[PDB]
Design a protein around this nucleic acid. Sequence first.
RNA 1: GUUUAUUAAAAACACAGCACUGUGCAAACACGAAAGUGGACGUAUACGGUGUGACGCCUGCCCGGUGCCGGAAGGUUAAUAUCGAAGCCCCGGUAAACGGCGGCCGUAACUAUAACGGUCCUAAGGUAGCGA
RNA 2: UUGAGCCUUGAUGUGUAGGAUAGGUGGGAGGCUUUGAAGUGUGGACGCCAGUCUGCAUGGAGCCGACCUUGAAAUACCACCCUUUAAUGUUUGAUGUUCUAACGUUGACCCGUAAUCCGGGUUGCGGACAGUGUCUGGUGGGUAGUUUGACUGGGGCGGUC
RNA 3: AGCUUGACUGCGAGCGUGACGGCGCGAGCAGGUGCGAAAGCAGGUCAUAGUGAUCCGGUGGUUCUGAAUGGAAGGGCCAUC
Lengths: 77, 149, 418, 234
Amino acid sequence: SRVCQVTGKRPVTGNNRSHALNATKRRFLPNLHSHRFWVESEKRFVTLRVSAKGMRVIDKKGIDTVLAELRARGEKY
Amino acid sequence: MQVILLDKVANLGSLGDQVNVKAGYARNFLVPQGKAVPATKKNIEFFEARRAELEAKLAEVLAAANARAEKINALETVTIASKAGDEGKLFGSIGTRDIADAVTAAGVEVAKSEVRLPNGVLRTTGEHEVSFQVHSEVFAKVIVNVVAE
Amino acid sequence: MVPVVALVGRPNVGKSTLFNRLTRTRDARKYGRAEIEGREFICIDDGVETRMAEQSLLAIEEADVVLFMVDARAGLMPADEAIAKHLRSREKPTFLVANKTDGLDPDQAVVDFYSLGLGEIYPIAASHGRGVLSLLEHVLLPWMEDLAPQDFDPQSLPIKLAIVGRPNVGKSTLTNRILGEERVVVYDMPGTTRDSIYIPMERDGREYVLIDTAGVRKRGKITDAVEKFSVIKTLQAIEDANVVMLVIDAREGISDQDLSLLGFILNSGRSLVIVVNKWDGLSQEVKEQVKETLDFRLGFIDFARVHFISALHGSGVGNLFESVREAYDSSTRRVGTSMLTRIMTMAVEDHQPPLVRGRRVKLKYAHAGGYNPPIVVIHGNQVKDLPDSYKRYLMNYFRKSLDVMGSPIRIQFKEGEN
Amino acid sequence: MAKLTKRMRVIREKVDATKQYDINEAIALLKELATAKFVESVDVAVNLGIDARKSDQNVRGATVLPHGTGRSVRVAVFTQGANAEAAKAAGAELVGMEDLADQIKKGEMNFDVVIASPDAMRVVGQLGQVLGPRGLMPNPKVGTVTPNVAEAVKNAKAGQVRYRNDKNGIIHTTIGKVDFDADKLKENLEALLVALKKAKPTQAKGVYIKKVSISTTMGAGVAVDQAGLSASVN
RNA sequence: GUUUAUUAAAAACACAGCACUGUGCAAACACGAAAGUGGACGUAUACGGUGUGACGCCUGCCCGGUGCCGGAAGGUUAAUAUCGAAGCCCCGGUAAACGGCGGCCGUAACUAUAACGGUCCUAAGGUAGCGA
RNA sequence: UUGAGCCUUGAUGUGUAGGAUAGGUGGGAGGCUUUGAAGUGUGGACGCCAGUCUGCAUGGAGCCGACCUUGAAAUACCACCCUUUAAUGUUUGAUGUUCUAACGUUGACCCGUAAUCCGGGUUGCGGACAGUGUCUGGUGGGUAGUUUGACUGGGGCGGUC
RNA sequence: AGCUUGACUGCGAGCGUGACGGCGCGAGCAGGUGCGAAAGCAGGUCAUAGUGAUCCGGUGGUUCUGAAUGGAAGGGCCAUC
């Protein structure tokens, strides 16, 4: 997809906008990328699709804490 | 993020230097390689007590890694220790090509720019003879006896 | 050689307002003089623009007498004091006046002002009427002791020309070149119109204009709060022409506004000569033949003549001077009922005057209603009996059979016979 | 030209970096510090913003203040059609248009502070061409280009603080001498400090007071335990 | 040849041939938010696009070298009010330049048209097609 | 390799007057600046260099200006921040080059699986790029909504308000 | 031609003239002024044309407003763009 698997993402509703203030809508994709994280706790990579807010978030809490979850979020490790 | 190093010495940062670093260097080089451990005001306390042991007891056959490193960054005088660099000069058949294993920088190497030899090289003691190519399909050679202690 | 009042009083404000009220002469345009009795003299007009400091500095040294100005609500101001000091050292006499004087009868003058390294500050009028009288009298007296400098042929006027174009290109710079070849700045403003506007100036008698609103390298005394006022000027640029020059770029030219601008030019009814400036830096395969082709097809029958100059090199410089003259001759061509009638006959015989409601029309002479932008009025059948198109067809024919590298020519139709 | 900016680096490294000092302590310090040979000046260096308006910023003048004491000056009260006739009733000082007129136009002057209505003021305190003082001179502005005369004489008789440089948006005001007492000095600051808050109504930034600093000369200066701020007038 | 089924068959549309451009493969491009797919199991003598319309016959003018043309800013030539602008380099622009594609003069036999040079310009120079 | 954000040194300010070179001094003609203090490059109004030229390389005069004039100002002792300019501390961004470790790999092979898909692993090649996400400037009749009066001896035309 | 600054100020019986928006005339009182010897005259121009609502914002003044509560912003008001 296009979702962090942590932070919680998906494109979300938009519009182009003008000082004209016209009406149209467009959504908005977050900045996610599947980045090859190193589990270390089984010393392998479990490449996950993740946000780039999230990339930070994973770091601050540490590998097996995001990876503590997933299991607790009932979804592909 | 920030780490306390585990590394003995490292070209910047050394010997339990707790510092902040680039995120893109830190998570994919300083860790996971053993050259650092994450820092937290929890971690630092654990680590401070630990490093009187860890950055000593581990870090004492590792003097080799900093020295041997030059020799594999150039690949002109391809030299690693198989057991050595901490035992005196690099000796025995042991080292590079006698198992055809030597560490590369990034798989782009000048240590297999030709293959030709019938049982590899290395077979002296108290020094270790490497083959130092002079072409890429003739092996007229210029063998050296470098060490990297 | 000759005096100039030379207003100063800080870079801007009501400074201009006063010049208009002292002048009355337009189309002499700028430089330009304020008339009093018999004698007329010129007028001349932190962290401010470097260009604006250079012109202003250029103005005051040639200036021959100076007038330093203060406002009602203005008083104290050290910057003013610096400008006043500069003037003393360099040495020309200065009188201290104060704009739309107001207050509540003369009071705070002269009291602040004695420190100004100047004494007696005369208060003025401009929106009342007594306070102008003293200033004009003061100047008069020394100036009275002295007495300083104060079909019709194509050569009866000197050729009038403007330089119009985009609100992007540094046209004002190209303007500096055209006036130059001397390697000298020239956009020093004096004031002589009604209100705060704008330079047409003349060199070689013949008039050049600088126009539009910003990017032009309009960074002036200011007067067009919105996008509008500038346009009031370009319409002046129309009034004054018999030649207009369009600067277009090869890298921001022919913009939507710009193509409209050429369409407008056709209305403007004045000779088009097409300039491309800052064209020595363009890529070796030019973009730009096609850019010429799209304008060509719209299409402007004139003489072009394309110019590829820079204001930062100059290449086209002669070829521009030349092209305008040639264009003016054709435009201004001595005309004459005879020629027109004779070529016309051919045209109608060849391709057929239109018929309307089973009744065939009738043409029967043409004459020239003036030549400078050439107009003709042909007396034939009714206005609607021709479409505008056939008018134009017959016009285009004349545009063809006798050269018009000049402006579009005009055709009219009157009725009387039917 | 510039050999090394070393002598100034060590010195500024001692007592400036916004080292906030007791106002009085500062003054105690102020007389000497680096070898400046005699007792020096007490200054406040007040930083005000902007250009296009002043209220008491770049003033080639002196204004009346709470606690006027420090100096007392010569004063003549010029009483001509104004708040002069209120001044005639007041009878403090000397009030007289045509006798003080003479005295103005005589050839000689010494009544520095012209409290004034229209004619006198232009003469005394402003004149010269490339004006500027022997080190001090009769000054023009005294707020009688904001004429009042009667009440003005009371304020005037008492004295007055002169400050001047040129054109910068930061308003310097020399507070006094060190041959004036420490606590009287503090009061001079406080007075100017209350005034400044008062000053400037014309929005361009709603707090116009940056640094209240107190300083002398020879790379010696300090900051005040800032107390000019917006809250009312303190 | 193709075609407006249920008015209109053509001169329309098509078409080989030709011309031009764009594209080096993960191709251009095209579809498909993308994934993917087509393009192509191919591979610049092609591929895509665009455009013109068999065929034959009507001559399609390269800016680099060096020169030339206009122009200024300079260079170069000047006085030595130094600065040096006019003519020329250069900057742009220039091949109806050297050199392949006109006249006019002499000359391929009614002189005259002329392959060569002179002459207009540091134009090849009516050779092709076509002649009162 | 190399721009610049800031930091503190530099010293001074063309009309008679004014020695010239008068930005801006609380206070204003002691400070025993003790040392026997100086006239010699930056500076400086302005090159109008001069000389006066610099806390700016000499020792030669009590510790010392070796006190003012005079104009607007200018000489005891100095003070208040600017324009300007370095030297130095820096702070930061560019380019330059090389690297590998993200990342890409429509290279090659091994493997789940006697599967052109995919996944994992190995290796080869690329490489901090590329590309993409946000933000953001320019372009954009391709797409989108609509705008284009009225008077009127038919209307439009014109002319007019 | 002398002299002045009433192109004052705060109000206004009472009128004309407009559908309304509204526009015009108007003595006198009051207060302050100005000029005139004094009476007296001065409320912009011989009269008739010389321009536009409403918004919304700018300028200056005011305490009027002002959300716990004081200030403070913005808004109203008065004047003007």
